[PDB]
Amino acid sequence: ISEIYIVRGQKESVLQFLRDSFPELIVTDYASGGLAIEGP
Amino acid sequence: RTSVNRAIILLGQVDRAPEIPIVQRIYTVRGQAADITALLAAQYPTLRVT
């Protein structure tokens, strides 16, 4: 499923962390639109 | 039929109308002040006279 997480704080924080603890996920970035987390 | 719904929700964020820089001025009413408050609340009904 794909959901949208609007970045609240810093950008790379929600970027760098999210790949580490969740490599089984993909974040589709929408420039200034936030994120589009999808996967399992 | 699904990518549209996802595009619209996204599109609201990326597309916003230009904002209006609300300015402040202080008026020193000459005459009554209750009547010139009611005037500015019928004329120009979005001025925020405090």
UniProtKB/Swiss-Prot annotation, chain A:
Disulfide-bonded cysteines: none
Listed transmembrane segments: none
Location relative to the cell: Cell envelope
Function according to Swiss-Prot or TrEMBL: Could be part of the type IV piliation system (T4P). May contribute at the cohesion between the S-layer and the outer membrane by forming oligomers. Could also be the main channel through which trafficking is managed.
UniProt family annotation: Belongs to the bacterial secretin family.
The name this protein goes by in its record: Probable type IV piliation system protein DR_0774
Species in which this protein is naturally found: Deinococcus radiodurans (strain ATCC 13939 / DSM 20539 / JCM 16871 / CCUG 27074 / LMG 4051 / NBRC 15346 / NCIMB 9279 / VKM B-1422 / R1)
Swiss-Prot record, chain B:
Family, as annotated: Belongs to the bacterial secretin family.
Compartments (UniProt record): Cell envelope
Protein name (Swiss-Prot/TrEMBL): Probable type IV piliation system protein DR_0774
Entire-sequence positions represented here: 297 to 346 of 740
Superkingdom: Bacteria
Organism of derivation: Deinococcus radiodurans (strain ATCC 13939 / DSM 20539 / JCM 16871 / CCUG 27074 / LMG 4051 / NBRC 15346 / NCIMB 9279 / VKM B-1422 / R1)
Lineage, highest ranks first: Bacteria, Thermotogati, Deinococcota, Deinococci, Deinococcales
General function of this protein: Could be part of the type IV piliation system (T4P). May contribute at the cohesion between the S-layer and the outer membrane by forming oligomers. Could also be the main channel through which trafficking is managed.
